[PDB]
Amino acid sequence: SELDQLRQEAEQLKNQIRDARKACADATLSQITNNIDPVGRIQMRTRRTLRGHLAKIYAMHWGTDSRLLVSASQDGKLIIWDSYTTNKVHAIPLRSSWVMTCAYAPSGNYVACGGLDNICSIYNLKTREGNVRVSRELAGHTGYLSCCRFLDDNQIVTSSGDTTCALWDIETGQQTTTFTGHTGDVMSLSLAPDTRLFVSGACDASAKLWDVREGMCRQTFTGHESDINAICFFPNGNAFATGSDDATCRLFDLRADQELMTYSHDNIICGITSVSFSKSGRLLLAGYDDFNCNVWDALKADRAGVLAGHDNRVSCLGVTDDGMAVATGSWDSFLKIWN
Amino acid sequence: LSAEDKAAVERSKMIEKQLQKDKQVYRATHRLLLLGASGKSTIVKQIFETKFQVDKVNFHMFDVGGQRDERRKWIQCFNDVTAIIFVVASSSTNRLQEALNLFKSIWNNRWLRTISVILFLNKQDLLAEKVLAGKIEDYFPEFARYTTPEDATPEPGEDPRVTRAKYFIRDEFLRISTASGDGRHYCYPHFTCDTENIRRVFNDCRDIIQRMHLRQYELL
């Protein structure tokens, strides 16, 4: 039964990796940041309330212009808001009503949305024929789609419920590579700022780091007790934050291949369903599941800010590319923008 | 002051009026989640999406036969679904216990805490000849102490013991349901089997509607 020997070097390799991580975790983050000054309870308010969605706002995404933002509701509605004039720039009916994610191309010319039909639909915004239309039906996944993010106007990276992330050439219509290796459904992928690599958190408590071109994993991290719901790379592209059903967040630093901090509290017992850093990084927006969102001092793991606002599950979150606000889309069908 | 943004706001209010129109066409349609283990091809008599109507009331039923079998995530989606058609077989391999723990999980979930289930216990007749010609106690022991309560109307002709088995299964599921959270939601267990179960779904939807309104009015 040579497989037993296989498991044997597997477990000794796990022991070797953990021992090396002990040899690399020789002073935790909280030890040295202790000497630094606090921040103070940030008194963020609402600034706008976007109210046009017939069903739970399940996903959201700003645009690079830091004014427009797309939002997807599971009544089957993908609507592009302008914030300042709070106007419904576009409102898009979908081929199927159940969607778990929207995406806004950094060029601003496309949006992408997908969900329980496994497909990623990419819609052309800046068409010259008037109304917006679905440019591409990226249909190769076997489970549902949970996150989609744009590299550029032509290639999309999409994580599914079949435990595979993927890279598609949008123009071609077929998948560039299949980032396979996970054991639980991928729940959130986060592109590195340089788009040379990206993290993905899944329902096996493990976060994987891949190489966008070689099409193969490069690291796995495990410091979170339960399924990973949300993930967001640091502005550096060196660390990332993960949020899980354990009701805590974790910093996974990419160079040290391990964890740095935990964001936990005695009161919180609800699975956090969204996460994202601010632009600088010193704050961390964790959209919890007791209807609130918390603002964690990422370098202190204290709770500073509390954005309450909502009257249901906050199912998405995202800061502007210029750090101008936070959009929170809950299950009460309101997007609250916060300065 | 809305120099060219006046026309922007004009198109915004036109699309917002469109949002009102499809609010009319949404709040009046019944989203129900199929959850299998049939009639779904017949329940659309009038691939994944399934739309039909009864008494000018429109039903949008989502079947989910396209996912991997780890549901703890892609089921939260249906916290706003009207009902769950929970199509479980009557002949159990141990199918009845897996169905039982699936039903229990659905009932207990924090998002589906306030969703009524419609229980369909398929193939009751097939179970009838199965357990008549030759079993139940071989999987559930507490079937030996069980007898059909007098408030259970049988289908005349078959064995009172077959009816006893059917109602034992139904009594297990309703023990699940009542064991926690009768304040918000209720199981409506039918006994499928080749009739119009569409009428059963429609009447149960009316019952759930009326119960929710009576519960906001502080009556039920």
């Epitope: 354990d246 | 079998d69 979930n109």
Partner: nanobody
């Protein structure tokens, strides 16, 4: 890592006894309700037992109640299953599982042999 080691199991004669056990690292063992699952050769899986956070609320499959018993020492972070008066049909691989998320009365564990928070499994055979 959320790892669940199991121990105990082998060829035993019918009617005998056995105490298969589970040492779990990678979570606060208190917060979840544990499980025992099994796969009998030629068959899929099935769930056998349940024990809650405190272990007050417990449950079994019909064909093992009274016969088998499930206990958990949260202080020692371990889950025990005492099998007694076994049967030829009880030969199967036994996996210690934990429910996906904490502080809940909800569980989605058994699968098409595709699940993340169960141990590797100890064989248990009941034959001559």
């Amino acid at each position: 890592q959320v790892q669940l080691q199991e121990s105990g199991g082998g060829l035993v004669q019918p009617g005998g006894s056995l105490r298969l056990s589970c040492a779990a690292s990678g979570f606060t063992f208190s917060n979840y309700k544990m499980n025992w699952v099994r796969q009998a050769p030629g068959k899929g899986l099935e769930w056998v037992s349940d024990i809650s956070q405190s272990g007050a609320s417990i449950s079994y499959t019909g064909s093992v109640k009274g016969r088998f018993t499930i206990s958990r020492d949260n202080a020692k972070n371990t889950l025990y299953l005492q099998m007694n008066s076994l049967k030829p049909e009880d030969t199967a691989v036994y996996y210690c599982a934990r429910c996906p998320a904490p502080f809940t009365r909800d569980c989605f564990d058994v699968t098409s042999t595709t699940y993340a928070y169960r141990g590797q499994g100890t064989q248990v055979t009941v034959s001559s």
